[PDB]
Ligand SMILES: OC[C@H]1O[C@@](CO)(O[C@H]2O[C@H](CO)[C@@H](O)[C@H](O)[C@H]2O)[C@@H](O)[C@@H]1O
């Protein structure tokens with residue numbers, strides 16, 4: 001028997017709902033699907049739908065009912081979705097689809113993407129105060145998984161992540177950023193899975209590696225939760241006690257790996273934490289050297305940005321923690337993966353579905369202690385045919401690094417699909433995510449984006465639901 005939702009979480013949840021219940025209702029974002037075997041016919045269906053939506057009958061029908069009817073057609077090879085809040089946006093977006101023109105709320109392709117999507121599990125720097133709260137209050141499936149992770153983390157570390165999510169006065173530190181983003185990562189993917197989606201492959205980045213192992217079938221949710229919990233409290237306790245000459249900084253620099261090779265001969269104590277993009281690398285080390293390399297970068301007109309931490313993960317500074325990390329993970333059970341893994345721990349190499357288990361106790365030690373080969377994992381996915389990268393996160397920070405690598409690999413038509421984003425309506429965001437999965441032909445039951453009909457008013461008087 002796991003712990004239940006704490007009383008303080010229930011208390012905070014009630015305050016949040018009363019807050020929510022007294023706000024201005026925003027019009028929901030509705031996906032309108034249209035498709036055909038031929039792009040020409042798809043374009044004609046779009047203009048026909050927009051003609052009718054302009055008619056008095058179409059004006060009197062709700063977007064939700066129009067979208068539900070559309071959701072029930074046959075879904076052809078050439079597809080499009082218009083995301084819309086009202087009839088104008090819809091008609092406007094439909095006119096672009098008909099015209100073959102681009103629009104911010106419009107996705108349209110002549111045919112499906114050929115290979116499945118890669119789920120990107122990062123997190124590093126994606127966090128913000130209220131992340132995940134709105135979707136917890138408003139999506140029952142999301143909320144169920146958050147509470148499930150919240151119960152396991154209560155059991156591992158003795159506190160409630162849900163309390164952090166719901167209490168606006170509270171913010172995130174080295175430790176709680178990791179367990180909370182993890183919880184958000186788990187809940188976003190299960191939400192997606194609930195609507196019929198699934199990863200073709202996963203790739204992770206530091207904190208995200210735990211969730212990637214779960215979505216890859218490499219660890220039970222419990223053992224993935226043990227993996228993120230042990231690493232995160234050790235890191236937060238470790239860097240908390242760092243002062244003076246024990247301080248190691250972390251910074252992003254616009255230097256490639258080959259540049260870093262040359263540049264580090266002047267700085268004997270610097271190490272690579274993350275190969276993020278082909279020309280962006282996260283480095284760590286003593287403050288004097290970190291400051292010097294940044295100064296070298298600025299003078300060379302390159303980007304350099306210091307992070308907020310007195311300790312450097314993925315460096316030798318993690319050596320004191322590894323003994324305890326080992327003890328806390330005794331008992332985990334690695335399992336043969338059920339989708340592909342681009343392992344940025346193991347230098348970015350690919351592990352086939354059904355291969356040998358990788359998510360060993362040694363794997364989590366190596367992951368915390370050593371460099372993250374992110375751009376190599378991504379480059380490897382591109383070179384093996386993947387074009388869709390979907391990032392589960394409260395903010396799509398890693399998708400920026402992914403775009404750098406895909407363009408560098410020559411792939412300019414990449415499907416870069418975010419999930420949540422700060423100051424974007426969290427429900428609208430997920431609508432948009434699942435819309436995009438559909439338009440590109442990935443696994444997604446577009447019918448599940450609409451509540452079951454309880455009346456004829458739930459459909460619009462169009463095919464396939466015309467009224468006799
Ligand atoms: O939720 C808004 C409103 O609720 C109050 C109590 O009436 O505070 C609740 O919500 C805060 C935000 O999450 C919590 O920090 C607080 O603990 C909780 O009681 C008001 O103070 C606030 O304006």
Ligand SMILES: OC[C@H]1O[C@@](CO)(O[C@H]2O[C@H](CO)[C@@H](O)[C@H](O)[C@H]2O)[C@@H](O)[C@@H]1O
Nearest residue numbers: 245266267268269285286287288289290
């Ligand atoms: O250890 C000496 C060696 O390392 C340098 C590199 O810049 O400095 C570092 O080591 C010092 C300890 O001896 C620290 O005080 C300092 O913070 C660190 O950058 C040079 O002093 C020399 O080449």
Ligand SMILES: OC[C@H]1O[C@@](CO)(O[C@H]2O[C@H](CO)[C@@H](O)[C@H](O)[C@H]2O)[C@@H](O)[C@@H]1O
Nearest residue numbers: 075437438440441442443444445446447
């Ligand atoms: O073409 C089939 C393919 O399309 C997806 C979405 O990309 O599912 C759609 O088509 C199904 C009928 O074949 C519908 O059941 C579903 O509602 C619709 O989204 C994929 O999931 C499917 O493999």
